[PDB]
A paper describes a structure:
The methyltransferase activity of MLL1 is regulated by three conserved core subunits, WDR5, RBBP5 and ASH2L. Among KMT2-associated regulators, RBBP5 and its yeast ortholog Swd1 play a pivotal role in the assembly and activity regulation of KMT2-family complexes. Both RBBP5 and Swd1 contain a WD40 propeller domain followed by a long C-terminal tail. The C-terminal tail can be further divided into two regions, a WD40 repeat proximal (WDRP) region and a C-terminal distal (CTD) region.
Selenomethionine-substituted crystals diffracted up to 1.8 Å resolution, and we were able to solve the complex structure by single-wavelength anomalous dispersion. The electron density map unambiguously allowed us to build the atomic model of the majority of RBBP5WD40 (residues 12–324) and two segments of RBBP5CTDM (residues 396–404 and 452–474). RBBP5WD40 forms a canonical β-propeller fold with seven WD40 repeats. The RBBP5WD40 conformation is almost identical to that of apo-RBBP5WD40 with a root-main-square deviation value of 0.39 Å for 319 Cα pairs, indicating that CTDM binding induces no dramatic structural rearrangement of RBBP5WD40. RBBP5CTDM exhibits an extended conformation and wraps the WD40 propeller through two segments, burying 1472 Å2 of the surface area at the interface. The first segment of RBBP5CTDM (CTD1) contains residues 396–404 and sits on the top surface of RBBP5WD40. Three leucine residues (L399, L400 and L402) in CTD1 fit snugly into the hydrophobic groove formed by residues from RBBP5WD40, including W35, L38, I50, W74, V95, L96, and the aliphatic side chain of K60. The second segment (CTD2) meanders its way around the side face of RBBP5WD40 and also pairs with the repeat 2 of the WD40 propeller to form a five-stranded β-sheet. The interface between RBBP5CTD2 and RBBP5WD40 consists of a set of hydrophobic residues, including I457, L459, V462, P469, L470 and L471 from RBBP5CTD2 and L28, C70, F106, I110, L111, P127, V133, V144 and L299 from RBBP5WD40. Combined mutation of CTD1 and CTD2 (L399A/L400A/I457A/L459A, named as RBBP5CTDM-4A mutant) further disrupted the RBBP5CTDM–RBBP52–333 interaction and reduced the HKMT activity of the MLL1 complex to the activity level comparable with that of the complete-CTD-deletion construct (RBBP52–381).
Author numbering:
A (entry chain A): 12 to 324
B (entry chain C): 396 to 404, 452 to 474
The structure:
Amino acid sequence: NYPEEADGTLDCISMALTCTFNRWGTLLAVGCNDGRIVIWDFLTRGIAKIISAHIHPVCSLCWSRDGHKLVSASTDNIVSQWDVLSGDCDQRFRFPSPILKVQYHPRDQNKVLVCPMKSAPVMLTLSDSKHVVLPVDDDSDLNVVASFDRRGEYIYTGNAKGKILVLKTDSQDLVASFRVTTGTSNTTAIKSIEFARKGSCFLINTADRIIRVYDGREILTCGRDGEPEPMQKLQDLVNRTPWKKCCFSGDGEYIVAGSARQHALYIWEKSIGNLVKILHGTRGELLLDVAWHPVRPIIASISSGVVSIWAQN
Amino acid sequence: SKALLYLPIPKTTNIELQGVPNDEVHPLLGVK
């Protein structure tokens, strides 16, 4: 199902900024603004390990497929791999601009996708510490966000002019592309691309405050410069809410989106597009992140330095 | 293979990217 009630907080002195569940949902890693990574035993809501990862705030985290490694990024352009069991730093990279996102290839944890600001995305290979700059469309200087699809067989990128590129992960061949445009046919920047843990659907969050949901299988069949039609367009027509972060439920049947203006989580049923629930946090606080548990109807959100948990309890 | 589920309680590489500006600010922290 989906959560429906506030169900406590994860109390830490470190100020939470971003969080992510491991594959099984047994651990929640929380990156904090003192540069620490706090790893919670999520089944008992107790702290399992604290890693002193960076000097400056942690802004992105991703667990490896086997659960043994975490990759982190700092707001002053560092990307590091951590061995979770030892807490040791395996290796460290320095980029020229701040890091918007890091993500392991979901089926090859030797590979890390990095999205620096005002740059093409970059693929790191950890075994030899080499990097490859991915291709871009339109202009070389736009902000570009990117995500592996569920199997990591493709990389989807989206730029500040609404251009979506679909690249084969191994060869970087451009297999499909399209441009998101508004009703006014102006361009709208891609803010994030998020994939479901099951199936083939993904969503795009854009600056026009509409969450567009597509089936990746349809995207591939439309090819280059296609005009695929979204399966759903999710938005608040009354408040014109911009979205900070969006996530699929673990079975891909629901979508949660956190408002960038109020402390509110909107939950839609994915196939029908109906709004099922809005969860309201403490008034006045700003949401920074949201994560849906991979197995259960439990959502974690971050505001005012605290992880809030929402459950059907 | 084998997986870490329960948690019972360095070499640096500089990546140089042509044309990427050096005065950007992370969106969490402000704007340039």
